[PDB]
Design an enzyme around this catalytic site. Structure first.
Site, PDB file in Angstrom:
ATOM      1  N   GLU A 267       0.822  -1.225   0.000  1.00  0.00           N
ATOM      2  CA  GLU A 267       0.000   0.000   0.000  1.00  0.00           C
ATOM      3  C   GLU A 267       0.853   1.271   0.000  1.00  0.00           C
ATOM      4  O   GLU A 267       0.541   2.255   0.684  1.00  0.00           O
ATOM      5  CB  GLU A 267      -0.902  -0.025   1.256  1.00  0.00           C
ATOM      6  N   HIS A 291      -8.202  -4.096  -0.597  1.00  0.00           N
ATOM      7  CA  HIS A 291      -7.326  -4.187   0.557  1.00  0.00           C
ATOM      8  C   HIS A 291      -6.280  -3.087   0.496  1.00  0.00           C
ATOM      9  O   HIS A 291      -6.084  -2.320   1.482  1.00  0.00           O
ATOM     10  CB  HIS A 291      -6.646  -5.560   0.615  1.00  0.00           C
ATOM     11  N   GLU A 292      -5.607  -2.969  -0.662  1.00  0.00           N
ATOM     12  CA  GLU A 292      -4.604  -1.939  -0.772  1.00  0.00           C
ATOM     13  C   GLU A 292      -5.228  -0.522  -0.630  1.00  0.00           C
ATOM     14  O   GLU A 292      -4.662   0.391   0.035  1.00  0.00           O
ATOM     15  CB  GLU A 292      -3.812  -2.105  -2.080  1.00  0.00           C
ATOM     16  N   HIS A 295      -5.971   0.500   3.115  1.00  0.00           N
ATOM     17  CA  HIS A 295      -4.758   0.960   3.803  1.00  0.00           C
ATOM     18  C   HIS A 295      -4.524   2.436   3.704  1.00  0.00           C
ATOM     19  O   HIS A 295      -3.738   2.956   4.492  1.00  0.00           O
ATOM     20  CB  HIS A 295      -3.485   0.297   3.253  1.00  0.00           C
ATOM     21  N   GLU A 314      -3.452  -4.532   9.727  1.00  0.00           N
ATOM     22  CA  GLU A 314      -4.044  -5.583   8.870  1.00  0.00           C
ATOM     23  C   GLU A 314      -5.472  -5.951   9.133  1.00  0.00           C
ATOM     24  O   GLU A 314      -6.235  -6.182   8.182  1.00  0.00           O
ATOM     25  CB  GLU A 314      -3.154  -6.838   8.871  1.00  0.00           C
ATOM     26  N   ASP A 371      10.095 -10.888   9.064  1.00  0.00           N
ATOM     27  CA  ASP A 371       9.829 -11.667   7.841  1.00  0.00           C
ATOM     28  C   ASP A 371       9.612 -13.139   8.125  1.00  0.00           C
ATOM     29  O   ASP A 371       8.971 -13.832   7.329  1.00  0.00           O
ATOM     30  CB  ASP A 371      10.940 -11.519   6.792  1.00  0.00           C
ATOM     31  N   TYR A 379      -3.899 -10.589  10.055  1.00  0.00           N
ATOM     32  CA  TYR A 379      -5.013 -10.337   9.115  1.00  0.00           C
ATOM     33  C   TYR A 379      -6.319 -10.987   9.584  1.00  0.00           C
ATOM     34  O   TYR A 379      -7.332 -10.310   9.774  1.00  0.00           O
ATOM     35  CB  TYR A 379      -4.701 -10.962   7.740  1.00  0.00           C
TER      36      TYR A 379
END
Ligand SMILES: O[C@@H](c1ccncc1)c1ccc(OCCN2CCCC2)cc1
Ligand SMILES: [Yb+3]
Ligand SMILES: [Zn+2]
Length: 605
Positions: A267, A291-292, A295, A314, A371, A379
């Site tokens: 985003e 979704h993007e 954000h 999220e 990561d 989410y």
């Protein structure tokens, strides 16, 4: 912020970055200066520390002189801290500009450099960045924490036949005075942002306008397809604006990256990055665009203070995403998707293990590489909390009243879960007796599935479950009864939910899977979500025919959602194990640095 080695916001704050850099494809380096306008938050401030990772510092200049600085020991995935000695002590609120001359490494974890042959056009190389969570420090020295928000401007010199774009409003382009074979592109971001939202792409990019404030960008060969796939973009932004309040970023552009982009989307402000794996030909994967888009409020205006609070980004974004999709397509489809995400949450909890710490809503990332910790939990467990609260507190109209009041309240801020929760109690003060029935300790701090499952309408799910239960309970003498017409009234979404359901019980007998191919021809389906779950099911049910198809998907694109489990599945199958490992080794050098790393860990190689 335990993921950052920089001086915290309580000590000093970056207000602005002016980046002047040149992209060197011959050496795979970005070179130049980061001028950080920094404000002191302490009396008598004489030094501060910045995050770096694999950077080569040439010099640091304040008030036109070079000043002393030191680089500490590398601390693994966090990089090395950079202590700068200020030439004059600062009083509280005093601001100064610090100019750092730096160069990046070819192996910057924030960057992927691609040869001409790894692109569509096959004549030019391509560069793209990905800063979230803590990779901005691998591009430039900064206080690399979402707890600090800065505006920025940049000037980027690139081979003149290529295009630079950033997460900012395009502010012009001219020949490079220092090198006539180059263009400098200029950028401005006037809205304060956490540094993880800083983004750059350089490549042979073209664009087509698809709405009043939206151009799609990609290489030439992807533009027409992209323009069509994402045509619902303006209508989604309008719905997002009705739910969240004004869109403040000016432009909403889409960049469609080459296939190794590790994520469905990112985003970046003014320029969302997406995976080409979204190009299904029919707009079916546009939830990722919604979704993007969401954000632009949750994440980009209200930001998590640290990565332990990522769920704030999220879960509210999935919550808004699912609303946009329900406006466009109806409340039963909202429930359909809500329920599948609970399905994805059972998957993730089952994988990590129900007591695993990464299955907590609020995590402690102190010595954990973000990561390695990343998954569907923030989410889906985040969304499940908000959907539960929606149903507790009076329904979606009532809870969207709160989400809009929450965005207003915390716009241009970085917040914690406690911040969110105090506001939730303030907003619903007349419903506190109800809020005190939530088991906050379990919901926020405990591992595994939530202590409560929300109520989901099943209308659209039922056919999916029914069909899946037929396959799973079928014996050999039932396989004839299956026929292409079984799929007759299923949307692509329901076909994908049928496979997701079936996949939860994998392996199935190999004769069943073969019959499934015979009657349904799932091999013909190029929808990346469907093809993904179908190859998984095939490999787990030990079908050898499916090895080359799974190897091909795993390496032809690099969206980790698909590449990671396909390699894992291929490694766990004894017939494809050696080839999986071999294929990783052969591809490793040319993979995204973060992707290479995780797949490597995944395979124990
Ligand atoms: O905060 C971490 C986390 C917190 C709680 N549970 C799990 C992980 C985390 C890990 C990786 C991230 O990387 C972001 C890469 N992305 C770019 C777009 C989509 C995700 C971002 C955040
Ligand atoms: Yb039978
Ligand atoms: Zn997201």
């Amino acid at each position: 912020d335990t993921c950052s080695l920089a001086s915290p916001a309580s000590v000093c704050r970056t207000k602005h970055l002016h980046l002047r850099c040149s992209v060197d494809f011959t050496r795979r380096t970005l070179t130049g200066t980061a001028a950080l306008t920094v404000q002191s938050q302490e009396d008598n401030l004489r030094s501060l520390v910045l995050d770096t990772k694999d950077l080569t510092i040439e010099k640091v200049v304040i008030n036109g002189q070079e000043v002393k600085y030191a680089l500490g020991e590398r601390q693994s995935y966090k990089g090395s801290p950079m202590e700068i000695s200020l030439p004059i002590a600062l009083s509280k609120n005093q601001e100064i500009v610090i100019e750092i001359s730096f160069e990046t490494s070819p192996k910057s974890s924030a960057l992927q450099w691609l040869t001409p042959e790894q692109t569509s056009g096959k004549e030019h190389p391509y560069l793209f960045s990905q800063c979230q969570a803590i990779h901005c420090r691998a591009i430039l020295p900064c206080q690399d924490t979402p707890s600090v928000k800065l505006t920025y401007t940049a000037e980027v010199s690139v081979p003149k036949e290529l295009v630079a774009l950033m997460s900012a409003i395009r502010d012009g382009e001219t020949p490079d005075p220092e090198d006539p074979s180059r263009k400098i592109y200029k950028f401005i971001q006037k809205v304060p942002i956490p540094c993880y939202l800083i983004a750059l792409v350089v490549g042979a990019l073209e664009s087509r306008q698809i709405g009043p404030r939206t151009l799609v960008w990609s290489e030439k060969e992807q533009v027409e397809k992209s323009a069509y796939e994402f045509s619902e973009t303006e209508s989604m932004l309008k719905i997002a604006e009705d739910l969240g309040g004004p869109y403040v970023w000016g432009q909403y552009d889409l960049l469609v990256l080459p296939p190794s982009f590790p994520y469905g989307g990112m985003e970046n402000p003014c320029l969302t990055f997406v995976t080409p794996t979204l190009l299904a030909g029919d707009k079916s994967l546009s939830n990722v665009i919604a979704h993007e888009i969401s954000h632009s409020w949750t994440g980009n205006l209200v930001t998590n203070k640290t990565w332990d609070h990522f769920w704030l980004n999220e879960g509210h974004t999935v919550y808004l995403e699912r609303h946009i999709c329900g406006r466009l397509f109806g409340e039963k489809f909202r429930h359909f998707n809500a329920l599948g995400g609970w399905g994805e949450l059972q998957n993730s909890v089952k994988t990590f293990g129900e007591t695993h710490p990464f299955t907590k809503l609020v995590v402690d990332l102190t010595d954990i590489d973000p990561d390695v910790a990343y998954s569907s939990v923030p989410y889906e467990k985040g969304f499940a909390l908000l959907f539960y609260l929606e149903q507790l507190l009076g329904g979606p109209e009532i809870f969207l009243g709160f989400l809009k009041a929450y965005v207003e309240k915390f716009s241009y801020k970085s917040i914690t879960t406690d911040d969110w929760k105090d506001f939730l109690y303030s907003y619903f003060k007349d419903k506190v007796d109800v809020l005190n029935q939530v088991d906050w300790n379990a919901w926020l701090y405990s591992p595994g599935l939530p202590p409560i499952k929300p109520n989901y309408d099943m209308t659209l799910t039922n056919a999916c479950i029914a069909l899946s239960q037929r396959w799973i309970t079928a014996k050999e003498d039932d396989l004839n009864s299956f026929n292409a017409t079984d799929l007759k009234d299923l949307s692509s979404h329901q076909l994908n939910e049928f496979l997701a359901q079936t996949l939860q019980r994998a392996p199935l007998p190999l004769g069943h899977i073969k019959r499934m191919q015979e009657v349904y021809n799932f091999n013909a389906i190029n929808n990346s979500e469907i093809r993904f779950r179908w190859l998984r099911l095939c490999i787990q049910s030990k079908w050898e025919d499916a090895i080359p198809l799974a190897l091909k998907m795993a390496t032809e694109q690099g969206r980790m959602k698909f590449t990671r489990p396909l390699f894992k599945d291929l490694a766990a199958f004894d017939k494809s194990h050696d080839q999986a490992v071999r294929t990783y080794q052969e591809h490793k050098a040319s993979m995204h640095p973060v992707t290479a790393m995780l797949v490597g860990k995944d395979l124990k190689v």
